[PDB]
């Protein structure tokens, strides 16, 4: 797993991403912004009841971020490097923006919580493993640290070469060896949907491991969150245009449109 | 390699024909519904203007007959369950395409070029898109009936022999995204070939129409629950933290 500062050119960061399916970006989010956001979402996180048994076994998952945290909708969402890398991954010259959000979720592995099974994120699109290691990307998660990731508080366990394996399968597996995603608040891993990984078991006793996941998918795929339905137009009018398209308030013809027109015309976001 | 079945035909006998040839269903939509629907969308279609083809998608808001009768077709869902489910399908688009006198032939294509990676998955790939292309007015060799190619789905690598899609009002052609086809030249002087397209796609795929964002909720409440999920007003995809989006919108 290579590592870059977020001051590094996008061509550089994305090259390691293509090769290994997986890069680490240091200060991908400014640590002051991450702690404002984290502070802002805290009354809501406290209001979440942990379950013990499931992917929600002693894990907090919370997606109401753009509606709850001003720092998220105004500053954290407006990451230029993210869009450079997303552009390079998903977009074709002349087709607009080739990507949108699948989900934007804070995941907090509680203490004692168990190692999540080794999966690929692209198992969500069941057919995608068949196109093989040389398939186009469907999914890229920018899995960010809100609080520190240690090996023992549940840092994501990643397999670096998974990106290029012979047969991408449901991990029916013939090899049935993982590395922790150690990082500091503000860092992030940028992970292909081809990369095998899973949450780590939080062996600590009070270290609530908090993360901020930006799950992005190609324009032609349906997201797990019905964002433009449950986000209010009040918040949407505070987002930048590229961010409104991230959440399905714009079409920025091809998909998610109104008779070939952008849906944002209908919603008032675009005026002729 | 192209078969025709009634609408009383057993859905598997219909799905078995779809599967190997990539199926015609006579009387898919009852002719009297299709007739009334076409009457309701007619003012709005009057209100529309080198390509000499009219396309109209605001069917759920325009037409009570479509909204309440034509959308509720139990055979359309029996077949989509057999094609997509492991509700594992939703709508891609609902369009009235009306080809006008003199309009040229449209280029042959597979509908699944919309998801540009699907052809690479070959002729044994899972289905991404099913179109139920139902005839509103009659289709004839003259007025530009669709040209289709029946075995072109099963081809190893995804000027050409074809069949015209001859049908009466109410008949559908149920067509895989893998099937090559194209509207014909409308050579008539007066025959506006009107058609009704149900483009359906599997649940993991995005639609070209942002239905739940332009169909008003005054309409959305007068859809059956399966038809609300068809249009994106219910839901695991398209949710609200795993919870059904239907709740937050008040329909559940
Ligand atoms: O939190 C982690 O370490 C991984 C989480 C993950 O992979 C998921 O939420 O699907
Ligand atoms: Mn995952
Ligand atoms: Mn077509």
Numbering used by the authors:
A (entry chain A): 9 to 61, 65 to 182, 186 to 190, 194 to 269, 278 to 297
B (entry chain D): 7, 9 to 29, 31 to 57, 61, 68 to 103, 108 to 179, 192 to 268, 279 to 295
Q: What text does the study give?
A:
AusE (Mr 35,100 protein, 314 amino acids) and PrhA (Mr 35,121 protein, 314 amino acids) are very similar (~78% amino acid sequence identity) αKG oxygenases that both accept preaustinoid A1 (5) as a substrate to form divergent products through dynamic skeletal rearrangement. Non-heme iron and α-ketoglutarate (αKG; also called 2-oxoglutarate)-dependent dioxygenases are widely distributed in nature, and play a major role in diversifying the molecular scaffold. This superfamily of enzymes employs αKG as a co-substrate and Fe(II) as a cofactor to couple substrate oxidation to concomitant decarboxylation of αKG to form succinate and CO2. AusE first desaturates at C1–C2 to form preaustinoid A2 (6), followed by rearrangement leading to the formation of the spiro-lactone in preaustinoid A3 (7). In contrast, PrhA first desaturates at C5–C6 to form berkeleyone B, followed by rearrangement of the A/B-ring to form the cycloheptadiene moiety in berkeleydione.
First, crystallization of AusE required EDTA treatment to remove any contaminating metals that co-purified with the recombinant protein and subsequent anaerobic reconstitution with Mn(II). We succeeded in solving the X-ray crystal structures of AusE complexed with Mn(II) and αKG (AusE-Mn/αKG) at 2.1–2.8 Å resolution. In vitro analysis showed that EDTA-treated AusE is inactive, and its activity was restored upon addition of Fe(II) but not Mn(II), indicating that AusE does not utilize Mn(II) as a cofactor. The asymmetric unit of AusE-Mn, AusE-Mn/αKG, and all forms of the PrhA crystals contain two, four, and two molecules. As expected, the monomer structures of AusE and PrhA are highly similar with RMSD of 0.6 Å over 248 Cα atoms.
